[model samples]
Target: TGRDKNQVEGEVQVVSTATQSFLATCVNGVCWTVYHGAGSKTLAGPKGPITQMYTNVDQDLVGWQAPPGARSLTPCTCGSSDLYLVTRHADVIPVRRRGDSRGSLLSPRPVSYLKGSSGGPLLCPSGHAVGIFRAAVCTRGVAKAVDFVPVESMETTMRASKKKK
Candidate 1:
């Protein structure tokens, strides 16, 4: 709570694959990004190598577990206008928590697949990432809600991955 934007900002990195770029955040050296048709793509940021992949493609989430030397970000439960989304370009977008379901719904919806923030980190008040921005519900240019994958749902996978080594 006492930290500033720089703390959160510093933790987020621009992940550039061969064909695209997305935002990625780390936890104990493991970098997380939305798996977009995984292939020969490689991480363009950070010094660590992506080892084991912790993810369920159906959940729209992926964790690129780096070595112990990578950076990490502290996570939060979730938030509202108290929430912010960091884009791949490092742009911060304000979002409001409308509710939750199998995933979550956010307001002031962002552009549909344009920000390149598909896997961007949704941060709480102090830049504590709470979730990963996934999809948005919209029609005819009018947006309804944004969907995100909560980190909590995937933490178990991450923990299990770390234990393997």
Candidate 2:
């Protein structure tokens, strides 16, 4: 039997206002930072609340653009059957709160850091989003909020391209 579209639903979350450093604890009793970047690379054990649905480290570069159509569960070093996917910036939506630690110099948006928002799911179950990993930063003391790419927008773009062709 087919499932109802509405019944197969999803949701999103706003980032927290409090920002915690690598000195935070997790349910698994491990301390991990919410960011890692710049020449000063630090070990980000795990994002507090930012969940990791998949792990294809080699293909998911630490500081690089996600390959084209990367979020499509494409084949990678992890193997085709493994169904590795890269988190696209377009798939991330910036989550912001008033008076948080905004981005540093190198950041595009002056993003603020927050506590209790780490290791959270950046994407919804519907596969419409790819959340920004708080611990994955390119600059010091700065990380992207819940950055995302809307699937609708992508589809629209694709449709327009086909129409022109």
Candidate 3:
């Protein structure tokens, strides 16, 4: 009960195959999923439903109505379908507490997600990567489901610079 908290911005990009669209925003220190109203066609904005996977990018998939293969942070449900997080690889890694901080240098657990960093970027101690912010800890658990993409894995998947490009 003597730990300090740090605040930061976070975001998550999500798409629903059912609706065939994508959304982005900031939720719980990370972006949340697309705001899908009860059987509605409108894509709501952040501060709406589905806080996790809230993102910063919002562009219809060329009116295709289907999730495309893009190397971007996407939405993912974990533990229960009610809970969600932005996948670091678009189709991999579900962020959760016990949720290891993505890194090799400092394997420390972070709470930026809990301090109001919805859908923002997770940076390494020295700004080494742009971590795809995940969700925060569950209310009745010792670990959180919000996880991050290791900078190394992100680099490998991106096949480019060692950063979230």
Candidate 4:
């Protein structure tokens, strides 16, 4: 309760042949990224555990873990209840609730600025992160609605991923 929201705000190196160097957030030390569901051969991050949670084509998440000191984002799963979309460039874009589709939140605004913001966080009015940036629905070359995966949806997977077996 005594932390700055900006403290956990930063980018992550997507680490591929070509990378977006996307933005990411960690929950209880487990960080989530967007491999976007291309198959990978790894099983552990705060630095590098490539786990994927594919709920839909749009809301899929790649799991990793970084130290809490580096980034900490708590998940709050609610329908289209987002406040800001902090982009890959660290630009804080204010977002409004549009709708919820397939367990993802949608924003009805021209987020043409989604430029390189594929894996960014969607912060709620309560300071909890609600989703991760995904695709946007466009009309007339403008993003009529933006989609993000609810960060809460990934908690179960991450918790299980940390299991000792």
lDDT of each: 0.56, 0.25, 0.30, 0.53
lDDT of 4 by residue, 6-32 (tens): 333353323332333455556445556
Best by TM-score: 1
TM-score of 2: 0.22
Clash number by candidate, in order: 0, 30, 36, 6
The C-alpha local distance difference test score for the whole of candidate 1 amounts to 0.56
Better of 1 and 4 by TM-score: 1
Better of 1 and 2 by TM-score: 1
Error of 1 at 54 (Å): 1.1
Residue-by-residue lDDT tens digits, candidate 1, 1-165: 111122232555545545655666675455676666433344333344345467656554577765444466665654244566666665665666666521233544536543466666677676566776666555555445556766665676565445455
Residue pairs of candidate 1 with colliding backbone atoms: none
Steric clash count of candidate 2:
30
Q: Pick the winner on lDDT between candidates 1 and 3.
A: 1
RMSD values, in order shown: 6.8, 17.3, 14.9, 7.2
- Where does candidate 2 stray beyond 4 Å? 1-122, 125-141, 163-165
Residue 55 lDDT in candidate 4: 22
Q: lDDT for model 3, please.
A: 0.30
Tens-digit per-residue lDDT, 45-138, candidate 3: 2223331211222221011111222223323332322223333223222332343443221223344323333333343231223344434443
